[PDB]
Amino acid sequence: GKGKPRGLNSARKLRVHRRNNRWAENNYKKRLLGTAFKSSPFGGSSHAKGIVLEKLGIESKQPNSAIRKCVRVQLIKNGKKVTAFVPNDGCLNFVDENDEVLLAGFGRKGKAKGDIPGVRFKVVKVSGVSLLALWKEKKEKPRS
Amino acid sequence: GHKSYKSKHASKGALKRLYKGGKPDKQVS
Amino acid sequence: TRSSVLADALNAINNAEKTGKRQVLIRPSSKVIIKFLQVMQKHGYIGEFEYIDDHRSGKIVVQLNGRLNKCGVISPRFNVKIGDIEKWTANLLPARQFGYVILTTSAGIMDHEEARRKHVSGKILGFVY
Amino acid sequence: PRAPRTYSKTYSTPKRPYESSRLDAELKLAGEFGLKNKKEIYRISFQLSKIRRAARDLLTRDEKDPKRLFEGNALIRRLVRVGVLSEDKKKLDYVLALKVEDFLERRLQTQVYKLGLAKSVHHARVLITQR
Amino acid sequence: GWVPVTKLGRLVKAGKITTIEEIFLHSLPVKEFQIIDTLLPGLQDEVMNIKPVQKQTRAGQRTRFKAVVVVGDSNGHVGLGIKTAKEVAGAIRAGIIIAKLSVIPIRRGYWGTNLGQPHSLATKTTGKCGSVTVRLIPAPRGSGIVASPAVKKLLQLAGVEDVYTQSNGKTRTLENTLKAAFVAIGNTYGFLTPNLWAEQPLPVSPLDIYSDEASAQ
Amino acid sequence: SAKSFILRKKELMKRRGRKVAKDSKFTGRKRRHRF
Amino acid sequence: GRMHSAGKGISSSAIPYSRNAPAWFKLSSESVIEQIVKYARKGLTPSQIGVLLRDAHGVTQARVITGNKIMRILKSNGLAPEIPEDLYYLIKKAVSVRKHLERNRKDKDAKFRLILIESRIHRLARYYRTVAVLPPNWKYESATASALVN
RNA sequence: ACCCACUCGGCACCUUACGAGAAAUCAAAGUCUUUGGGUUCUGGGGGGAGUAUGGUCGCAAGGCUGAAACUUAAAGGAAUUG
RNA sequence: UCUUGUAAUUGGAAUGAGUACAAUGUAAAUACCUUAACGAGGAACAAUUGGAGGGCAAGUCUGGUGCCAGCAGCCGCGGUAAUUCCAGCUCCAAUAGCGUAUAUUAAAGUUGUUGCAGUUAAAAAGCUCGUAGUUGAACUUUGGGCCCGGUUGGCCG
């Protein structure tokens, strides 16, 4: 029984039945078509570097605020524009206009510690220094 | 209440309650 | 339709033992059914069995006696290289010491402990423990 | 185009890094032998697993197989001469029941402490590294 | 001082039965728990889970507490009990009563050869209760108990040392995971290994030969 | 509404019967000011 | 079950466990042979000959009394027909329902049963031209089978 | 024609669990972690979507075949309780 | 009467990171190995990276800022869709390493040959015929006797 051929000369069916059903996957189909090379903002890249255009007030609410707002950045290679995520306030004075930031994916989220929908690109470095070291007063960012 | 009808793609009668209310594709050589 | 008649007999034995029957009628009868049973009988898993001979294909009455946890057939009969005997018994036997998987070798139908003493192999036929 | 010098890792971190039973077990080992970091337990539990895995695949093999007889007696000789086994347990069925503390007992700083000369286990280590 | 109330209470009060092999070979139905306290000491007790469950009524709210307790001494004997009681204290007391009443022998074995005080299970064995399957595979020496912490505690209590434990299904349920493991090691003794193929001497079930002093007063 | 969620699931495991630590005034705070 | 329907009936005949000539018959062996070839000369069909012996002349079955089956007796004496027994009858049914079908245009059910009969002809024909009884094409077409039956 | 007994093949009905299931329930949904009698089809989280595009058959209405980008932490099913 | 922890209590030992005669090293050097001489009393010669509703290991911690048509009114308490607003203390893990991002593998029996599933949760073509494909009842030297030489355990040594 079990709904599939089982006899000893049925390897052609078992080989090509798997090939068609593998197309109903998600990691496999996204890999073979190479949609990382056709649609994603990152061209299959882990990081991307881009020019910041403007900073948004995507705020938690009106004045009584949990300040987590970030910028509108255009990637430099494919020319696509994405929305970024900066850490806690006090780093917005670092990021001016046209600073050429290096940004990476945000990815993991819980039901706390950052729940902003529509952003998946945290900013790692600004003007080629850092944001961890620049926030913790290790170095200084040159002005353009 | 009643148990609802179920299908993966919406039925033609149910689209009529909703809906009534080109560039061809390319394969890069 | 009745493709494999070894699957019929081994199913009829396992259905009969679990419900507590004392003997079961097996039909049809075969060389491979007879030679399967003789290995199971010689190892004490089943008791005495008698061949009823009408002219068509025979029938077998098997006197069960308990002491048979499971017997079954492996279809299709896979080509077992002699090094793959150890890999088989890990998959379909409860322990390492007891349990037998039955092979059709060129030296006759035999279990796996006997086959590795003779250093033969062949196609797998089924299992018993 | 010179030949690539082969290298391999000698330790393996555990898959479940946070269990209160094992975290207290390894810390007990570290204090009583004076171990600098948990890699030292990781390293022993790596090569112990290699010895048990090699001897386990020999035990699936039948008796009197010369591959089992040659490799098995080689493995018994190597562990007894180091000192992990005793002279009365020279069989393959006993090397499966080895323990991590058996290997740590055969170290240098553990052995120099057992021979006097140290007065504490941490003094044994710091004496050795000062040549 | 325990007062015997059933027939089997008279069996253990005179001390004519001492070992558990005779009572378990015929598998006598046991109703009371007090005969094991007076016969087998050293039962290590561990409470596993306590939770409150509620019952909604017309006006008020009636609550109770469900407790699971696994009991074994150190070796080959284990019992698991299910009990809902009105208070947390009585759930422990009545939980142990039904757990010790559900005691069953555990049949151990060897991974390899048969030498030196068996450490593991004999056969591959499983247990299922409501989409929770627990499988137990024998392991060689030094392998430890690679199991869930509740099942590892259950297997530490039963008396095994070397067990592989692969599991399937949505095993987040704790009350189903324990009894699936309990029936698996309960199924091990139900399995018939060919070492027991020799015929038993057919004991006379000595309940009848001692019924003269075990009848009503 | 992070504090509302953290309390809501916490007495649920009273009824499920598992250990959970008793609380104080750090329950709904960012434990780490970020990068 | 059946080849072309959902029936599962097991009506059959049971040959006895006696492979040899029961005692009360004791008539002859050659006399049924001249009886067989006499009935075949009348123009009968090898099933009709076998059923008429045991209804009348007490021949239990011609396989055991003579030693050969009825087909091999007729083929030895050269009375065999062109196409075999059953393949002839399948065409004779298929012709009659087809003659019926052209008379009744709107018989959708006869149209379905004709597909079933014609399918049962092809499976039988592929067997016979495999064992080299018919010519190795034999080409059953609809029109010429009307001539093949009469 | 009716009654009794048996048998073959049917449409179903009631009780039960040796078993099976998440449960309702099931003589099959049984003989499956102790997993292999033969063989066809279909499915792989929800929206976007039976949409776009191409091919095909249809007088037409339409039917058949049939995606992806993007977005989302759901989407469900079984039984009872206030 | 014999064993541990604590201290802005105390004492001398030991050593290499360094500097460096020399020598080894090297085509010549640098570096390693050896070594005359100098080289430790803590802000010396000062270890970081992450984490604390569960995972999961680690708080009945502290201070400050802003709001409350909430109680009380010398103080305070509580909330705060401030998704804690800003800092600190404590604790845990790994350790000259540690974190993040993307890809892939295990977990995974969510690709299922081993090893999934299709009544009600995704999924049995409306139904039947039918070519390739896959699969296909039982059956023909079974048994008995003879000796021969082997590899394993032993009663034996």
Swiss-Prot record, chain B:
Coiled coil (UniProt feature): none
Localization: Cytoplasm; Nucleus, Nucleolus
Biased composition (Basic residues): 1-20
Family: Belongs to the TRAFAC class translation factor GTPase superfamily. Bms1-like GTPase family. TSR1 subfamily.
Record's function text: Required for 40S ribosomal subunit synthesis. Required for normal export of the pre-40S particles from the nucleus to the cytoplasm. Its subcellular location and association with pre-40S subunitshifts from mixed cytoplasm/nucleus to all nuclear in RPS19 disruptions, suggesting it acts after the ribosomal protein.
Subunit relationships: Interacts with RIO2.
Note: Present with 1390 molecules/cell in log phase SD medium.
Record-given protein name: Ribosome biogenesis protein TSR1
Organism: Saccharomyces cerevisiae (strain ATCC 204508 / S288c)
Lineage: Eukaryota, Fungi, Dikarya, Ascomycota, Saccharomycotina
From Swiss-Prot, chain D:
Keywords assigned by UniProt, alphabetized: Cytoplasm, Isopeptide bond, Nucleus, Phosphoprotein, Ribonucleoprotein, Ribosomal protein, Ribosome biogenesis, RNA-binding, rRNA processing, rRNA-binding, Ubl conjugation
Compartment list: Cytoplasm; Nucleus, Nucleolus
Gene name tied to this protein: RPS9A
GO molecular function: rRNA binding; structural constituent of ribosome
More about this protein: Present with 106000 molecules/cell in log phase SD medium. There are 2 genes for uS4 in yeast.
Keyword Ribosomal protein among UniProt keywords: yes
Gene Ontology biological process: maturation of SSU-rRNA from tricistronic rRNA transcript (SSU-rRNA, 5.8S rRNA, LSU-rRNA); ribosomal small subunit biogenesis; translation
Family designation: Belongs to the universal ribosomal protein uS4 family.
GO cellular component: 90S preribosome; cytoplasm; cytosol; cytosolic small ribosomal subunit; nucleolus; nucleoplasm; small-subunit processome
The protein, known as: Small ribosomal subunit protein uS4A
Main location: cytoplasm
Record function comment: Component of the ribosome, a large ribonucleoprotein complex responsible for the synthesis of proteins in the cell. The small ribosomal subunit (SSU) binds messenger RNAs (mRNAs) and translates the encoded message by selecting cognate aminoacyl-transfer RNA (tRNA) molecules. The large subunit (LSU) contains the ribosomal catalytic site termed the peptidyl transferase center (PTC), which catalyzes the formation of peptide bonds, thereby polymerizing the amino acids delivered by tRNAs into a polypeptide chain.
Keyword Ribonucleoprotein tagged: yes
Signal peptide residues on this chain, from the entry's feature table: none
From Swiss-Prot, chain E:
Superkingdom of the organism of origin: Eukaryota
Subcellular location: Cytoplasm; Nucleus, Nucleolus
GO cellular component: cytoplasm; cytosol; cytosolic small ribosomal subunit; nucleolus; nucleoplasm; small-subunit processome
This protein's record includes keyword Ion transport: no
Span of domain S5 DRBM: 43-106
Record-linked Pfam families: Ribosomal_S5 (PF00333), Ribosomal_S5_C (PF03719)
InterPro entries cross-referenced by the UniProt entry: Ribosomal_Su5_D2-typ_SF (IPR020568), Ribosomal_uS5 (IPR000851), Ribosomal_uS5_C (IPR005324), Ribosomal_uS5_euk/arc (IPR005711), Ribosomal_uS5_N (IPR013810), Ribosomal_uS5_N_CS (IPR018192), Ribsml_uS5_D2-typ_fold_subgr (IPR014721)
Gene Ontology MF term list: small ribosomal subunit rRNA binding; structural constituent of ribosome
BP-aspect Gene Ontology terms: cytoplasmic translation; positive regulation of translational fidelity; ribosomal subunit export from nucleus; rRNA processing; translation
Annotated function: Component of the ribosome, a large ribonucleoprotein complex responsible for the synthesis of proteins in the cell. The small ribosomal subunit (SSU) binds messenger RNAs (mRNAs) and translates the encoded message by selecting cognate aminoacyl-transfer RNA (tRNA) molecules. The large subunit (LSU) contains the ribosomal catalytic site termed the peptidyl transferase center (PTC), which catalyzes the formation of peptide bonds, thereby polymerizing the amino acids delivered by tRNAs into a polypeptide chain.
Membership in a protein family: Belongs to the universal ribosomal protein uS5 family.
Protein name, per record: Small ribosomal subunit protein uS5
Swiss-Prot record, chain F:
Region (Disordered): 16-35
Domain of life: Eukaryota
Positions occupied by motif Nuclear localization signal: 17-24
Membrane-traversing stretches: none
Protein location: Cytoplasm; Nucleus
Miscellaneous remark of the record: Present with 1620 molecules/cell in log phase SD medium.
Family: Belongs to the class I-like SAM-binding methyltransferase superfamily. BUD23/WBSCR22 family.
Function: S-adenosyl-L-methionine-dependent methyltransferase that specifically methylates the N(7) position of guanine 1575 (m7G1575) in 18S rRNA. Requires the methyltransferase adapter protein TRM112 for full rRNA methyltransferase activity. Important for biogenesis end export of the 40S ribosomal subunit independent on its methyltransferase activity. Required for efficient cleavage of the primary 35S precursor rRNA at site A2. Involved in positioning the proximal bud pole signal.
Subunit (UniProt): Interacts with TRM112. Interacts with ECM16.
Protein name: 18S rRNA (guanine(1575)-N(7))-methyltransferase
Gene: BUD23
Shown segment, full-protein numbering: 241 to 275 of 275
